[PDB]
Amino acid sequence: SSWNDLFEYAVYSRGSFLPNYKFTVRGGSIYSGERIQTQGEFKAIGVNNLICKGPEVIVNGGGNSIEIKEIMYIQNKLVFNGAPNTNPNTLNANKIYTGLGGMELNGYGYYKANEIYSDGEVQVKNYGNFEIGSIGIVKKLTVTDNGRTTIKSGATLYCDQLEVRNNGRVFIEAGATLVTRAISISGGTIEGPGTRQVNPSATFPSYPPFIDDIKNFDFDSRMSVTTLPADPVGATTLGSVYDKSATPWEIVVYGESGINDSELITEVNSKLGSFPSNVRLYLASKGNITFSNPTSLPLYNPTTGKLVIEGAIITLGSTFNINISGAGIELIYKRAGSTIESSITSTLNYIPPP
Ligand SMILES: [Ca+2]
């Protein structure tokens, strides 16, 4: 699997991506060209990459749990806004990069990165817990307001500046090392059996190459968005292409002005003569997606209270909202078969990089 392949994404958003409350993506990758803003209970389980090339990624509320297996690229700023101690956030990420806007890890949360690189200030505050498993290279690390940052054994943090304040704590484990060019501890602690080194002329290692690779990739250049097709069969706003040679059946639904659940029931049944609960669904829309009555879709699971979409969602508008009434989404990534890829490649005039 490749981070520059459109068909690797569970969510590919050309513009922004504002999911509904209670949204789980399981597998695949997540891309947005502009802002990502999640309004609570957002979960990424087994996500390979999360690439955001816009100005913010704002994770709001509690109960968020994000797992990144490879690269989390944050073009400018990432902000976990704050979780109740009764519904804390978790982040487990392999490699994280942020640009100049930083990474604000507000608290009631356990945030782990194995590698962290940042052209800005990593803040850990308001009881947040941040652990670096192997390496860190950041402009600034500041722990305040009862935060905690642990350098785990074997790891090395490099930061140009280190600020600890208002009962912030930095723990350096045995065999770990923190290396800063300047330091300012007023009100906070640094303990632990590892080495802490102040060196105004320290030489840091180089960023790994994936950072520039992604910064340098013009995602938009790979496609030419024109109009999304529509047929009068079924919902007159939507178009679709389907594949019954696959198991389960696969259908991609195109909606130039958005998609809703009434239209989806109409369109799918017209093409398939039914709407089996196991259908693999690929939604491609230039407006929002709205499920006003999700229990009407056979994808709704009454036991979990979730719409279970197996497939992927491609959104092409500048702004994009998923809205749903009285249910959560469980989007399980499933790579499309070739009939569906050919339809999407044709529709978006897509040229895969390799
Ligand atoms: Ca139609």
Say how many Å lie between the CA of residue 339 and the centre of ligand 1. 18
Structure-solving method: X-ray
Quote the DSSP letter at residue 258.
B
If you write DSSP's letter for every residue of 287-317 in order, what string do you get?
S-EEESSGGGSTTEETTTTEEEEEEEEEE-S
Binding-site entries? 231, 233, 235, 238, 267
Q: Which domain holds residue 296?
A: 1-354
Q: Are 83 and 64 in contact (CB under 8 A)?
A: yes
- Distance (Å, rounded) from C-alpha 222 to C-alpha 215? 15
The structure tokens listed for 346 are 């044709």
Binding-site entries for Ca(2+)? 231, 233, 235, 238, 267
Helix, strand, coil proportions of the chain in percent (round to 5)? 10, 50, 40
Say how many Å lie between the CA of residue 297 and the centre of ligand 1. 17
Say how many Å lie between the CA of residue 323 and the centre of ligand 1. 22
Read off φ and ψ for residue 214, nearest 5 degrees: -80, -45
- In the block, tokens 């279970």 appear at 308
Say how many Å lie between the CA of residue 306 and the centre of ligand 1. 26
Say how many Å lie between the CA of residue 25 and the centre of ligand 1. 28
How many domains does the chain contain in total?
1
Say how many Å lie between the CA of residue 255 and the centre of ligand 1. 9
Say how many Å lie between the CA of residue 31 and the centre of ligand 1. 28
Say how many Å lie between the CA of residue 259 and the centre of ligand 1. 11
Q: Are 67 and 106 in contact (CB under 8 A)?
A: no
- Give me the sign of the Cα torsion angle 191, 197, 199, 203: negative
The structure tokens listed for 257 are 């002005």
Closest by CA to 64, choosing from 48, 79, 74, 49, is: 79
- Resolution of this structure in Å: 2.7
Say how many Å lie between the CA of residue 227 and the centre of ligand 1. 14
CB atoms within 10 A of CB 250: 25
Closest by CA to 188, choosing from 162, 170, 161, is: 170
- Distance (Å, rounded) from C-alpha 112 to C-alpha 229? 43
Q: Look at residue 119 and give its three-state secondary structure.
A: strand
The structure tokens listed for 79 are 């902000």
Say how many Å lie between the CA of residue 254 and the centre of ligand 1. 9
